[PDB]
Structures are given as C-alpha cells and as structure tokens.
Amino acid sequence: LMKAVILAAGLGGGVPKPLVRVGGCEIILRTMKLLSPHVSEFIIVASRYADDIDAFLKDKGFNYKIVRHDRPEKGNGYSLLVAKNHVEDRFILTMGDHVYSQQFIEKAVRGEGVIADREPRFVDIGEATKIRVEDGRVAKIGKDLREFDCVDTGFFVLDDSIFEHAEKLRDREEIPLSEIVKLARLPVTYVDGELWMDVDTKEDVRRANRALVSAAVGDGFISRKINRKISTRISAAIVNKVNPNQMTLISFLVGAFSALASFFSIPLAGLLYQFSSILDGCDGEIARASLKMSKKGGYVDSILDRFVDFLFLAIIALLYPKTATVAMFAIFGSVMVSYTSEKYKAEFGESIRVLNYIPGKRDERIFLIMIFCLLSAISLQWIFWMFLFVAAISLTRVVVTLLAVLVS
Amino acid sequence: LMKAVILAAGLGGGVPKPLVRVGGCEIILRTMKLLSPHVSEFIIVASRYADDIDAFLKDKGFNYKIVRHDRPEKGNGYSLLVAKNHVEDRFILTMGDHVYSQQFIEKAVRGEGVIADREPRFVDIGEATKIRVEDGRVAKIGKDLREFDCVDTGFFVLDDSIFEHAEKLRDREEIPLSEIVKLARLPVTYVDGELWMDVDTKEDVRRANRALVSAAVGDGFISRKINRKISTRISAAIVNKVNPNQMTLISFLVGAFSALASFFSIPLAGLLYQFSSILDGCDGEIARASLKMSKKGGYVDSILDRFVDFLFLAIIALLYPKTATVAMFAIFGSVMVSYTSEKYKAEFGESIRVLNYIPGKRDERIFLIMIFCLLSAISLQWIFWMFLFVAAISLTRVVVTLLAVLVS
Ligand SMILES: [Mg+2]
Ligand SMILES: [Mg+2]
C-alpha cells in the first residue's frame, strides 16, 4: 500500500470545497475513507484553508499531514512540486473537490498514470479535461480538445519520475497540472461509466446526493417495485440534513404513532404503517451513501422494527379481544421471520443462499396489513382474517426456512 | 506445524482400543481432531487391526497414512523404529489408547520431549509409568519406581536424535518404549492436573465419559444451581449412545408434549416443561464432549426452543381467552429476549459484555412458569399473573439490553 496526495488549493457556499458536504459527508473525508485501506499515509496540500482542513481532520483517526504553500494562484502543478519530499516510489494524486464512488476507487488504485473515463455519466462533457490517447499514452490534454478518446477524472497514480518533468516548469508564472501530464507521456488507465464528479454549484451537490443515494440501494416485491422508489427520493433530499441515527428515531416514531393511530380510524393506521415501512429503509440508504454505517445503528433499528410490528398488531387486539387468540400466532410468526434470518447470520456468519418466492418479508407483510386495515372500515370480519393471514405466511416462511437449513 | 505419530499395537469389548468409543467419539479420532490444526500429516503404526483403522479413517477428511508391521509383541519401541523414514526434524508421538482433553493437548504440543504430569487426577497412580527427574531431564522411568517426581502421560514431542538411541536396541527381543526414553536423556515437559487417561476397562470408559462431559459445561441461576447438575449426569450416561441431533429431537418432543400436556392437568405440564428445560442443555453437552459441534444443530435447536416456549404459553391461552391479551406480551417478550442476544452476535460478531442481574433467561423464566402452573390448581387467578410476570421480566431485560447497547 502506497501514499496518497490530495490537492486542495482553490477555489472557494462560503465553505471550502474539500469541506463542502456531499451525501452526508464532506468531499475530502469521503476520499480518505475510501482510499484508507489502500493507503499508508495521506498528504494534503492546502493554502488559505489549511488550518480549517487540519482542524477538521484531527480526530478522524487518519494518518495524515498538511503541506502548506502561500502561492495557490500559480496552478495545480506547483501544488504537486511542493509535495515532492513527502513521497517515495509510487503514490496517488487526487483532487480535493472531486467526489468518487467506492466502485470507482477500487478500479482506480489498481491503475497507473492518468485515470481516464471514456464515457462520463455524471459530469459536463462541455466543461471537462479532455484527453487524446496514442499508444495507451497521453498524446494531448485540455478542456477544449476537439478530438478526445476519454476524459480526465482528476485521479492519478504516479511515481518519482513525475517530478523531473514538473521541475522543468518551476520558473513559470502559472503551472497547470494539465501541461505536466503531456511532458511525462503518462500511461492512460481506463475506468469508464463509474460515479465521479467535481463539485462546484449547490446544484452539483444535489445531483451528487441523488447519485450517491441511488447507488446506495433482502428487498421483497413491495420494496423493489414501490418502497425503494419513494424512499430514495426522500433520502437524497435529506441526505446531508439528517444523520442515520436521527432517521432511525423518526421512522420509529412514525411507526409507533401509526400503531397508536388505531384508537381512531384503523384504516388510517394501516396507511401510516405502510408509510413507516417506506421510511424504515431511509437510515440505511443514508448511512450507506454517507459511509456512516455502524453496527450499533443496525442493531437498534431492528429492535425498534420488531417493537413497532408488535405494537401495531397488539393494539388492534386490545380493542378486539375475540381476535387476540389469533393475534398470538401473527405476533409470534412476525418476530420468528426476523429471528430465523438473524439466528442464521450469527451461527453461519453470513446472510441469505435460498429461494425467495415464499411470502413474506416485512415489506410485503405490512403492505397486506394496510389493505386488510382498509377492508376493516367495511367489515370488522376482515380483521380476524388479517391476523390469520399474517400468521399463515409468517410461520410458513419460518417453517420452510427451518426445513431448508435441516438439509445441508 | 509438524507431523504426529500415533502408535496402535495391542492390546484388544472386542473392538480395538483406538476404535473404542469414549464420550461419543472413538479414541484415535478424538486425538487427531485435537492435533489437526497443529499437525501437517498423521502417521499411524498398526499391526493386526491396521485394515480396520484404515477403513475407518478414509472419509474423516484427515491427512494420514498407515505404517504396518506384523511383529507387535516386540514392544512399543519397535513401533517407533519402523516409523523412522516417514518423519523429519521435530514430530509428535502419542498412544492410540489414550484420551486427551483439548486443554491438555494445547499445553502439550508446545512442550518438548516427555510430557509429564506431577499430579494425575484421572488415572491410577498404582498402575502408571512413573518418572524421576534430574536436571529437567529423565533420570529414570518405569511402572514400579519408588521415588518419582511425575507420571508419563503417553504424549511425546521428539526429534531425529531419538532414532539413534532406538536403533541401539534393534536386536532385542522385546523393546519397550520406556527404556528408550532413558538412553536419550529426554527433556521433561510439565502438564499437570489436566484431563488424560488410558482406556482399558468398560469402567474406564464411563469414568472418562463423565470426565469429558463434566469438562464440557450464558447459564442463569436455575441452570447453574439446578439444571446443569441434572443434565450432565444424563449426558454422561447417554454420551456414546445418543448423538447431538437425536438429543435435539428428544428434548423438542418432550417440550412439545409438555405444552400439549395442558389439555389435562396444567400443573403437570409445568413440571414436564421444567424437565424439558433440563434436557435442552444435553445436546450441547454431548456435542462439546464428542467434538461433534455443528452450526446446523445450534440453529435448529434454537428454533425448536422458540416454538416450544410459544406452544406452551399459547396453548394455555387457547383454553383461557381472558388471559390471551396478556399472553401476547408474554409471548412477544419471550422471543425478544432471544432475538436481542442473537441480533447482537450477528451484528457485532460475538456473544454477551454486560451484567446478568436482570431476570430472566429461558432457564429462570421456565422455572417460574412451572411454579405458576402449580399455583394454577389452587386458583386460576395465578395464570393471568404468570403471563404478566413473564411479559414483565422479558420486556424489561429486552429494554435494558437495548438501552445498554445505545451507549457504546
Ligand atoms: Mg430500517
Ligand atoms: Mg438446547
């Protein structure tokens, strides 16, 4: 594993580009978290906001040091020159204002020289650093190139030979990192159609938010064809406004209130229940997109789910004791569905290695409950059939799952 | 990791000593399973029953080969001589009729020369190979030694220098492995008070069965002070008669029948329920003692437990619908106790990092249920208070466990 050099000089909603938050995470922190397993030490080149960037990275638990220079207007190339003494052999060079998906960086750090993209999806083809290739090597570079075989992603894997070509321009007034790439005749590595972009406008942030969240999505039929399409739009909107823990609480409160909502108008309680089901997938989407995933959150979220599922069925039963005997089976089967998956992962170390095709997971189950709650206003006879239906599909899935593991 | 040499020649309930089953596992297989991670290849020296031992080890998935000699009556030393060409450098030498605990072998394979025991617990001090030590070295050996500082465990870690001393006796009629140890002036390694014995009488088998099972035991107060003391005696008795899977089924059937037993005499159903709780710990004891532990068994056993716990509470409720609303909370909390532990292990990778002190785990819970079932015959008013009590301690433990993980 080598060293990585991140360049932050210019330009500057009042917040410096590396510290601008995209998808519930600041740009420079996202880069470091993804490069971390592949990198021994991080070298940041900062000028005006060096103190701000340094003060931010202190408790992040990363191995880093900031290299300062007070002359940012002489180009991105000079930022590279001043970092010469802090690197050895092979190293990584990336931009502080660029956003990268984990899929991109995995196919990046294995590359060499310039990382190129033959068909950029998320950036402006008009404004982009265009590259023409000859002999798998950079024959040209620029924003205005007429004939180009790929586009610069702002990611580079370089070596000690790059300083020799860089020192050649040391006496220039402005030293664009672009021109340096030409002289060195650098190898072109291809990573195409992945998620990468440069953040400039607050509009770019929103476009990136959607991109990261969309890329962040055991789903069932309802979850696939309905719930995920509603939740991703909500998540992308609140992605840097709300953190995964707050979303866990919100989805729990909505869910709990939906269970309480059966005191007045049960058919309404079912609608709110389905809406809580839609929301329940937001914290995961946010955590995945912000790289904020934590075992503690997954644990708590699952327990609150189990409590909401219960409170909803048990509150109906409190009002209608005739169905309370059937409620037992629905309630028990409801938890056992989750327990079968969870006991598996604890014991075998991995999730589920099976066929779906048997209803039903929480998403489908809740959806039917909503309908049966709607049929309630017509007739109270549909309640009993709800409890029995829930108990039927749950326990069946639980038994088949048990009967499946027996054979191995 | 080195090579291990197991000696099986003599002597011979009609079954050859290495194939004699002790603690639900044959002697030679137990040895190999324990040495396996520490050993590259196994070398077995067999004479009369070589085919039988070979035919047995075929599908065991071990790396081994059998070295044959037709002259077993010339002593254990000759068995060592004939294995000279199949080993290199350092190697392990052990007896095919000796039973060893995992605790013993872990402190054995790190040793050198003769493994000695200064205070043998499980063997006959009268009949044992006694060793007198001088300068951490074997100064004497024999069954009849008057002054001895330790006793031979039949386990050895040797090297190429041992054949030179062994070839010295090649022309002898009987070559006891004992005499060879003297000549080589072998280092004495001390492993004291561990579980090891030689199996000769069917009585030795039973004594070993108890020893292995006793050494094979998230227990609560009832489990510690009552249940484990009854279950270990049952397990030790049936240890090589019943396999862990059969015991899982038996404890499930008893449990299920205890739940059905509420149709007639609920106070009886509670007694059978407590007895099923006692039995529920047998499969684990057997699997641990027989080295037969499998993730599949643990999975199935836990699911059947959850079903028995439910069937018991739900069958009472079917007969008494007035308590069916309180039954919901008891049933839900009953499963959630297990779910909280299991979701933890899946998410965090390990078990429970806490304080006990809050009732209650399944063992305590079931015990109280038995009592409340006894109070039922007096008054049916105790039923309701059972369901409520179960729901009270369960959910409380579940909440405190949840509230505990929040802080980390
Ligand atoms: Mg969730
Ligand atoms: Mg068990």
Swiss-Prot record, chains A, B:
Superkingdom of origin: Archaea
Chief location of this protein within or outside the cell: membrane
SUPFAM superfamilies the UniProt entry points to: Nucleotide-diphospho-sugar transferases
Protein name: Bifunctional IPC transferase and DIPP synthase
Annotated CTP binding sites: L7, A8, A9, K17, D70, E106
Membrane found in the keyword field: yes
Compartments it resides in: Membrane
Keywords: Magnesium, Membrane, Metal-binding, Multifunctional enzyme, Transferase, Transmembrane, Transmembrane helix
Biological-process GO terms, alphabetical: phospholipid biosynthetic process
Keyword Cell membrane: no
Annotated stretches, region: MobA-like NTP transferase: 1-216
Catalytic activities: 1D-myo-inositol 3-phosphate + CTP + H(+) = CDP-1L-myo-inositol + diphosphate; CDP-1L-myo-inositol + 1D-myo-inositol 3-phosphate = bis(1L-myo-inositol) 3,1'-phosphate 1-phosphate + CMP + H(+)
One GO MF term attached to the UniProt entry: phosphotransferase activity, for other substituted phosphate groups
Segments traversing the membrane: 252-272, 312-332, 366-386, 387-407
Topology relative to the membrane: Multi-pass membrane protein
Function field: Involved in biosynthesis of di-myo-inositol phosphate (DIP), a widespread organic solute in microorganisms adapted to hot environments. Catalyzes the condensation of CTP and L-myo-inositol-1-phosphate into CDP-L-myo-inositol, as well as the biosynthesis of di-myo-inositol-1,3'-phosphate-1'-phosphate (DIPP) from CDP-L-myo-inositol and L-myo-inositol-1-phosphate. The cytidylyltransferase is absolutely specific for CTP and L-myo-inositol-1-P.
